[PDB]
Amino acid sequence: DLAPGIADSLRHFKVLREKRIPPWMEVVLIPMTGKPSLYPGLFLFTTPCRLVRPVQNLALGKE
Amino acid sequence: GGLTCASAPQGTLRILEGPQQSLSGSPLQPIPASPPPQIPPGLRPRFCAFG
């Protein structure tokens, strides 16, 4: 019950360039249900070879 | 005079620091939507027949 808020807080840091979260960290939160969905858990990638793309973040308008 | 095991703790507290959510405004774009291509005013014909 803290994973959603943590993911949203981390996404707000990267967007507003707060803390030291790299502007390009991927905060992923693969939810867990009872179904055979992808393995659950909060990943956070910041490695130097991933592909990224810009999108206008609504609720903040901060790209 | 040594250290002995004491009573088991009755509870646990886990502290974390968390900020809150703002209002949903959802300001999608500076100049938004795909603005349509359109007619230059008046224009005028730039060609005539012979005669």
Angle at CA of residue A51, ends A33 and A35, nearest 5°: 10
CA distance A3 to chain B (A): 12
Residue type, B5: C
Which residues in chain B touch residue A5, judged by CB atoms under 8 angstroms apart? 18
Nearest CA in chain A to B17: A6
Residue type, A25: M
Q: Find out whether B29 and A56 touch, Cβ atoms under 8 Å.
A: yes
Residue A55 in contact with partner chain B when CB distance is under 8 A: no
Q: Find out whether A30 and B44 touch, Cβ atoms under 8 Å.
A: no
Expt. technique: cryo-EM
Residue A9 in contact with partner chain B when CB distance is under 8 A: yes
Resolution in A: 3.0
Cross-chain residue pair A8–B22, CB shorter than 8 Å: no
Give the DSSP H or E segment for A8: helix A3-16
Nearest CA-CA partner of A59 in A16, A28, A20: A16
Q: Residue B43 in 3-state DSSP?
A: coil
Q: Residue A51 in 3-state DSSP?
A: coil
Whole-angstrom CA distances from A2 to A14, A17, A41, A53, B11 are: 19, 22, 12, 27, 20
